Amino acid sequence: KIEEGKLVIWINGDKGYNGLAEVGKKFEKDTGIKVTVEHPDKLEEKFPQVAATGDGPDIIFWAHDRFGGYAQSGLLAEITPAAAFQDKLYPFTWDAVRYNGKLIAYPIAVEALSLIYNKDLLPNPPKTWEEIPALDKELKAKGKSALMFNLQEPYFTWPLIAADGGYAFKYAAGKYDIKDVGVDNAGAKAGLTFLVDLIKNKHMNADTDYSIAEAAFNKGETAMTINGPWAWSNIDTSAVNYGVTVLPTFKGQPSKPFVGVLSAGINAASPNKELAKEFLENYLLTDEGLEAVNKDKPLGAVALKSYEEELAKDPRIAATMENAQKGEIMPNIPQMSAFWYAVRTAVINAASGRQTVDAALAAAQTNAAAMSAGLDIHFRGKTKSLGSEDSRNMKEKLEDMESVLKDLTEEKRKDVLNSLAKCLGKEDIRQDLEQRVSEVLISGELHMEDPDKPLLSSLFNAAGVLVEARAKAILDFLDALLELSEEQQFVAEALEKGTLPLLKDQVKSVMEQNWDELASSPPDMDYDPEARILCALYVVVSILLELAEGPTS
C-alpha cells in the first residue's frame, strides 16, 4: 500500500504542516504530482512500525536523533545530494544526518529550547533557576504562576538535568560509549531533584503537559514557559508581549538543552525516491519554500545558508542559537530511543512520587544501558563446529513458556529463578545447565533435590513424573539468553533491584511497537536485525519477571 507518482509526507503536529502543504501545492502545480501532508500522533513511533511492513509515507520529518535507529533497521534511503547543493547548507547540519558515513536525511532546520517570558508580568527574566521558587511566591500573590512547561516529555526537562552534569552517552575522544550512560550521576540527581522540589512545593504541577503550558502562557496566566521556535506563531496571534532569552542557570552552570536538527528522510520502501529528491532539494530547501513553512510556524535557524542570513537578524533566533551553543547537539545513534524512553519514565515517576529520584534515575540508567547494549549489533558473532527446528512464532513460544511456568509450586518457581539467575553473565554456567536439562529430556533423572538440581527437581510434577514441557521451556529460555551478550549484566541488575517491569515495558515500546505483529515466519537466517536480539531480551525479561512473580526477587 505505497502509491507510485504521489508524495505522502509525515511531519509533527506542532510544526508548520499547512505551510509545507503550500509548498506541496506549488510542486503539484509545476510537476503535476499530488502531495499529501499528514500529521499522525506518536509520529516517530508509528513510522518504523509502518515502514517495516513496506507501507508508510515517502518522506518523514523528525529531529535527527530518531534517524540512526531508522537507518539501522534499513527504513531510510541513502540520499545522494549534488556537491554543489551540499554547499548551500551549513556543514554541521549534514553531520547530524550522517550515520556510519552515509547521509540518511536532508537537514532542514536547527531547533533548540529557549526561555520564553512575558514582559508585562515580568520585565526582567531570572538569570538563575534557583530564583524561580521565590518569584512564584510573588506572582502567586497576583493570581499568576512563575513557570509552566511540559513535564511529560524529557526534551523539556533535560536541560535542567544536564546542567550540573547529566549526560546521555559519554563522548570522549570523539566517539560515544554505549555502556557509559550519565543519568545516574550526581549532577543529574541534583537537577532532577530540584525539579521535583518545585512540584513538591506546589510551584509546578506534575500533570502539566504541552497543551496546558502553552494555553496558560498565551492566556497570560503564567510568567514564563520553555519551548522551541514552533511555539512563537501561536503566541504572536495571542495578545501577549513576550521575549525569548537564554535558559536560566542551575548551580551557576548553563542549562544544556538537547539540540535537534529537523530533518527529512526518504522511505526506503518508496518508489518515488527521485520525486522526493526533487521536492526536497529544489522546492522545499529554497528561500521561497522555507519561507512558506516558517511563516506558518517557525522552523528556528534553518539549515539553508541563503535563507538563514535573513532569519539571523531576528532576536529570537539569536536567543535560540545562544541556547543551542550552551547545549549539546543530539547524537543520531539508535540507542537514543533507549535513552529517551528510560528518562521519560524516570522523570514522570519522580515527579508523580511513584519512585524516589535516586531510584528512578538508577533504573533509567540500567534500563537505558541494557537496551542500548541490545541495539548494538556490531561485532556480534558465534563459535562452533541437537540444534532445533523450532517451527514456532516467537509470540507463540513465549505464550507457551509462560503457561508452563504459571502452573508451578511457589517453592519450585523460586528454585527455578535462583538457578536461571546464576546463568546471567556466566556463559559456562548457562552451558552446563543446558547440557544437564538436555540430558534429562533425552534420558531419566527422577524426584529428588540438590544444591543446583533444585531446578532439575522442578521439571518433575507433584507425582514424580517428568513434564517435558518444562524442560523445553527452560531450554527455550536458555537459547534466548544465549543471544544476549552485554545486557545480561543489566538484566541481572533489574532482577536484583526489582525493576524488571520497567525494563519489560521499555523493551516492549522499542520493539518497534507491536509484538503480535513483530513475529511471523520462523527464523530463516535471512532476516536478523535488532529484531532477533530484542526478542530474546524481551523473552528473558518476561520469563524472569513471571518467575519473580507479583513482589519478589
Ligand X SMILES: OC[C@H]1O[C@H](O[C@H]2[C@H](O)[C@@H](O)[C@@H](O)O[C@@H]2CO)[C@H](O)[C@@H](O)[C@@H]1O
Q: Nearer to ligand X by C-beta: 153 or 180? A: 153
- Which range touches ligand X (CB under 6 A), out of 147-155, 297-305, 476-484, 544-552? 147-155
- Which range touches ligand X (CB under 6 A), out of 87-95, 148-156, 242-250, 452-460? 148-156
Query: Nearest to residue 370, comparing CAs of 120, 136, 95, 178?
Result: 178
Looking at residue 66, what DSSP letter applies? G
Q: Nearer to ligand X by C-beta: 324 or 491? A: 324
| E-strand stretches of 246-310 | 249-250, 253-254, 258-266, 301-302
Q: Residue with CB nearest ligand X?
A: 63
Rounded to whole angstroms, the Cα distance separating 302 from 295 reads: 13
Residue 319 CB, shortest distance to ligand X, in Å, is 16
Binding mask 70-89 for ligand X (x = CB under 6 A): --------------------
Q: Per-residue b/e over 117-152, b at no fewer than 16 CB within 10 Å?
A: bbeebbeebbeebeebeebbeebeeeebbbbbbbbb
Q: Nearer to ligand X by C-beta: 126 or 300? A: 300
**What is the phi/psi pair of residue 340, to 5°?**
-60, -45
360, 284 Cβ separation under 8 angstroms: no
Q: Which residues pair with 111 in a beta bridge?
A: 260
Largest interatomic CA distance in the chain: 84
| Backbone CA torsion sign across 313, 315, 317, 322 | positive
Residue 182 CB, shortest distance to ligand X, in Å, is 17
Residue 154 binding ligand X, by CB under 6 A: yes
Question: By three-state DSSP, how is residue 391 classified?
Answer: coil
Among 22, 65, 164, 434, binds ligand X (CB under 6 A): 65
- Please list, in sequence order, all residues whose beta carbon lies within 8 angstroms of the beta carbon of residue 535, skipping any fewer than 6 positions away: 394, 480, 483, 511, 518, 519
Q: Nearer to ligand X by C-beta: 153 or 310? A: 153
Binding mask 227-266 for ligand X (x = CB under 6 A): ---------------------------------x------
Residues 283-342 binding ligand X (CB under 6 A) are: 340
Q: How many other C-beta atoms can be found within 10 angstroms of the C-beta atom of residue 434?
A: 18
Binding mask 8-27 for ligand X (x = CB under 6 A): ----x-x-------------
Residue 112 CB, shortest distance to ligand X, in Å, is 8
In order of 36, 246, 299, 314, the CA distances from 230 in angstroms are: 21, 17, 6, 15
Residue 479 CB, shortest distance to ligand X, in Å, is 33
Q: Nearer to ligand X by C-beta: 63 or 275? A: 63
- Which range touches ligand X (CB under 6 A), out of 59-67, 95-103, 293-301, 378-386? 59-67
Among 7, 11, 63, 417, binds ligand X (CB under 6 A): 63
Helices (H), ranges, 302-356: 305-311, 315-326, 336-351
Q: Nearer to ligand X by C-beta: 110 or 494? A: 110
Residue 66 binding ligand X, by CB under 6 A: yes
Residue 20 CB, shortest distance to ligand X, in Å, is 14
Residue 134 CB, shortest distance to ligand X, in Å, is 29
In order of 292, 369, 411, the CA distances from 489 in angstroms are: 51, 10, 25
Q: Nearer to ligand X by C-beta: 439 or 505? A: 505
Write out the H or E segment, with its range, that includes residue 512: none
Q: Nearer to ligand X by C-beta: 117 or 155? A: 155
Q: Nearer to ligand X by C-beta: 209 or 278? A: 209
Among 153, 281, 328, 486, binds ligand X (CB under 6 A): 153
In order of 51, 58, 269, 312, 366, the CA distances from 55 in angstroms are: 5, 9, 7, 39, 34
Residue 47 CB, shortest distance to ligand X, in Å, is 12
Q: Nearer to ligand X by C-beta: 126 or 154? A: 154
114, 320 Cβ separation under 8 angstroms: yes
Residue 230 CB, shortest distance to ligand X, in Å, is 7
- Please list, in sequence order, all residues whose beta carbon lies within 8 angstroms of the beta carbon of residue 516, skipping any fewer than 6 positions away: 395
Question: By three-state DSSP, how is residue 213 classified?
Answer: helix
Residue 214 binding ligand X, by CB under 6 A: no
Kindly determine how many residues on this chain lie close enough to bind ligand X according to the rule CB under 6 A. 11
Among 22, 58, 111, 184, binds ligand X (CB under 6 A): 111
In order of 132, 234, 249, the CA distances from 260 in angstroms are: 27, 21, 21
Residue 513 binding ligand X, by CB under 6 A: no
- Which range touches ligand X (CB under 6 A), out of 150-158, 355-363, 417-425, 525-533? 150-158
Q: Which residues pair with 147 in a beta bridge?
A: 224
Rounded to whole angstroms, the Cα distance separating 348 from 502 reads: 13
Q: Nearer to ligand X by C-beta: 66 or 189? A: 66
Residue 65 CB, shortest distance to ligand X, in Å, is 4
Residue 432 CB, shortest distance to ligand X, in Å, is 42
Q: Nearer to ligand X by C-beta: 163 or 262? A: 262
Q: What is the binding site for ligand X (CB under 6 A)?
A: 12, 14, 63, 65-66, 111, 153-155, 260, 340
